Ligand binder design. Structure first.
Ligand SMILES: O=C(O)c1ccc(-c2ccccc2C(F)(F)F)o1
Ligand SMILES: [Mn+2]
Ligand SMILES: [Mn+2]
Ligand code: NA
Length: 259
């Protein structure tokens, strides 16, 4: 669907709120803190300060407000008061808020304590894969091209792209069409049009692409237990490119990408 100027404004608000949850939580992401407390901090902020709601809680039965995944956990890590962050960890906090009917969806990696060169490299490359994709977004381009570019860049780094999950259209619905694969697929045939709003959120494994879902029916880890990183932004396709609706102060890419 093509969002209207009004809907896009609402997406800007929702996207900014999502991004600000990530900016707000940054100081709390330090050695010793539990992912459970991080989640509570994020939820209180979303509800009490942003006057918004987490779109995650309850979705497909998800128990928490945000997803927090550490190191080998690929995605959907469930915040737990007993899971503490430690020196060297790489942690993804994935946020999605609903404000005035629209969704803002974004995530980023945080390196805890003294960074490891491997962790820093995986996160940097993963973000760069998102960035290169964002720089390709504009009317007329096929999502297949973008997915192909992400995969090519990631694999060239000796990393892999997780296939079970993809980006997605977003708006009044958390996950709307189209599906945004982060790898080349013969099934992908979607030509971008102005006003389209979707996410790009590649999950990159340091090791093999295969994953394993834990027995809590949520937590996903790399099959080989290698590190996995993910970054995500919600965007709106413009006439000559795109606008990142979930940009943060620490992002090293412009909010408005012109061509
Ligand atoms: O960025 C996303 O699109 C995202 C993060 C987590 C999920 C998800 C996917 C399937 C079922 C439940 C959830 C959620 F509840 F954790 F949001 O979707
Ligand atoms: Mn997300
Ligand atoms: Mn998403
Ligand atoms: Na991870």
């Amino acid at each position: 669907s093509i969002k209207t100027p009004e809907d896009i404004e609402k997406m800007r608000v929702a996207g900014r709120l999502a991004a600000e949850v990530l900016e707000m939580i940054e100081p709390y992401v330090k050695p010793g803190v539990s992912t459970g407390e991080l989640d509570r901090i994020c939820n209180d902020y979303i509800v009490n300060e942003q006057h918004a709601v987490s779109a995650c809680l309850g979705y497909h039965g998800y128990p928490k407000s945000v997803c927090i995944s550490i190191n080998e956990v690929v995605c959907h890590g469930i915040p737990d008061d007993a899971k503490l962050l430690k020196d060297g960890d790489i942690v993804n906090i994935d946020v999605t808020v609903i404000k005035d009917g629209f969704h803002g969806d974004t995530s980023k990696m945080f390196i805890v304590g003294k960074p490891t060169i491997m962790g820093e490299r995986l996160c940097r490359i993963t973000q760069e894969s998102l960035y290169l994709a964002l720089r390709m977004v504009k009317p007329g381009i096929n999502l297949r091209e973008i997915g192909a570019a992400i995969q090519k860049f990631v694999e060239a780094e000796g990393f892999s792209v997780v296939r079970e999950y993809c980006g997605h259209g977003i708006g009044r619905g958390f996950h709307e069409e189209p599906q945004v694969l982060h790898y080349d697929s013969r099934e992908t045939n979607v030509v971008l049009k102005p006003g389209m709003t979707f996410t790009i959120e590649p999950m990159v494994n340091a090791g093999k692409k295969e994953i394993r879902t834990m027995k809590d029916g949520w937590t996903v880890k790399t099959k080989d237990r290698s590190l996995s990183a993910q970054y995500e932004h919600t965007i709106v396709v413009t006439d000559n490119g795109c606008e990142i609706l979930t940009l943060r102060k620490d992002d090293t890419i412009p909010a408005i990408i012109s061509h």
